[PDB]
Design an enzyme around this catalytic site. Structure first.
Site, PDB file in Angstrom:
ATOM      1  N   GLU A  35       0.835  -1.193   0.000  1.00  0.00           N
ATOM      2  CA  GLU A  35       0.000   0.000   0.000  1.00  0.00           C
ATOM      3  C   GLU A  35       0.883   1.261   0.000  1.00  0.00           C
ATOM      4  OE1 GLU A  35      -3.202   0.293  -0.499  1.00  0.00           O
ATOM      5  OE2 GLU A  35      -3.992  -1.701  -0.194  1.00  0.00           O
ATOM      6  N   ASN A  46      -7.762   8.934  -5.727  1.00  0.00           N
ATOM      7  CA  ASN A  46      -8.493   7.932  -6.484  1.00  0.00           C
ATOM      8  C   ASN A  46      -9.454   8.636  -7.429  1.00  0.00           C
ATOM      9  OD1 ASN A  46      -9.055   6.492  -3.283  1.00  0.00           O
ATOM     10  ND2 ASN A  46      -7.483   5.838  -4.701  1.00  0.00           N
ATOM     11  N   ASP A  48     -12.667   8.525  -7.909  1.00  0.00           N
ATOM     12  CA  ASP A  48     -13.936   8.984  -7.344  1.00  0.00           C
ATOM     13  C   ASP A  48     -13.766  10.274  -6.536  1.00  0.00           C
ATOM     14  OD1 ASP A  48     -12.615   8.093  -4.967  1.00  0.00           O
ATOM     15  OD2 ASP A  48     -14.403   6.956  -4.265  1.00  0.00           O
ATOM     16  N   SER A  50     -11.749  10.659  -3.843  1.00  0.00           N
ATOM     17  CA  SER A  50     -11.256  10.420  -2.494  1.00  0.00           C
ATOM     18  C   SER A  50      -9.732  10.339  -2.558  1.00  0.00           C
ATOM     19  CB  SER A  50     -11.848   9.179  -1.898  1.00  0.00           C
ATOM     20  OG  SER A  50     -11.578   8.075  -2.734  1.00  0.00           O
ATOM     21  N   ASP A  52      -6.316   8.174  -0.404  1.00  0.00           N
ATOM     22  CA  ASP A  52      -5.834   7.178   0.521  1.00  0.00           C
ATOM     23  C   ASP A  52      -4.651   7.778   1.274  1.00  0.00           C
ATOM     24  OD1 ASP A  52      -7.746   5.337  -0.472  1.00  0.00           O
ATOM     25  OD2 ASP A  52      -6.269   4.358  -1.804  1.00  0.00           O
ATOM     26  N   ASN A  59      -8.952   5.411   3.332  1.00  0.00           N
ATOM     27  CA  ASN A  59      -9.643   6.170   2.310  1.00  0.00           C
ATOM     28  C   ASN A  59     -10.525   7.240   2.942  1.00  0.00           C
ATOM     29  OD1 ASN A  59     -12.333   6.263   0.347  1.00  0.00           O
ATOM     30  ND2 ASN A  59     -10.402   6.156  -0.797  1.00  0.00           N
ATOM     31  N   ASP A 101     -15.351  -4.548   9.219  1.00  0.00           N
ATOM     32  CA  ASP A 101     -16.558  -3.939   8.657  1.00  0.00           C
ATOM     33  C   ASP A 101     -17.344  -4.921   7.769  1.00  0.00           C
ATOM     34  OD1 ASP A 101     -18.198  -1.322   7.936  1.00  0.00           O
ATOM     35  OD2 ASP A 101     -17.342  -1.919   5.958  1.00  0.00           O
TER      36      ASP A 101
END
Length: 129
Positions: A35, A46, A48, A50, A52, A59, A101
């Site tokens: 990562e 990213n 969309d 957002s 990281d 995110n 989650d």
């Protein structure tokens, strides 16, 4: 801060990540390797809109607030910039909610693509833990 491999392993073990949600320490280390390359200051936008953040690339859409992400939920209740600290505490606590989650470490697409199913124990070889 750029962590060493065994440096991060020892920190992650100490914050109780080894075997968390059944994921061994090698998994979490492997994930951090692919990562962030073990770099706490890593950020990555990213498509969309957002971003990281940090050692485990967490995110801004769901988990932390960066002030610029459409549809932010800030489920970890944390500024994304706190996930860029040399202290990994906030990153570790947040990773615990994400991996709990529902879909496990699959949230981490570098983990899923590069660690899942591989010989992850390799990622703690030689470490005094």
């Amino acid at each position: 801060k750029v962590f060493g491999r065994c440096e991060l392993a020892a920190a992650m073990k100490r914050h109780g990540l080894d075997n968390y949600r059944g994921y061994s320490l090698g998994n979490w280390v492997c994930a951090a390797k692919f990562e962030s390359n073990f770099n706490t200051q890593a950020t990555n936008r990213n498509t969309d809109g957002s971003t990281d953040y940090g050692i485990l690339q967490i995110n801004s859409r769901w988990w932390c607030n960066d002030g610029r992400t459409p549809g932010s939920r800030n489920l970890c209740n944390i500024p994304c910039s706190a996930l860029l600290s040399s202290d990994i505490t906030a990153s570790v606590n947040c990773a615990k909610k994400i991996v709990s989650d529902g879909n496990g470490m699959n949230a981490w697409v570098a983990w899923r693509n590069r660690c899942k199913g591989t010989d992850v124990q390799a990622w703690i070889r030689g470490c005094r833990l």
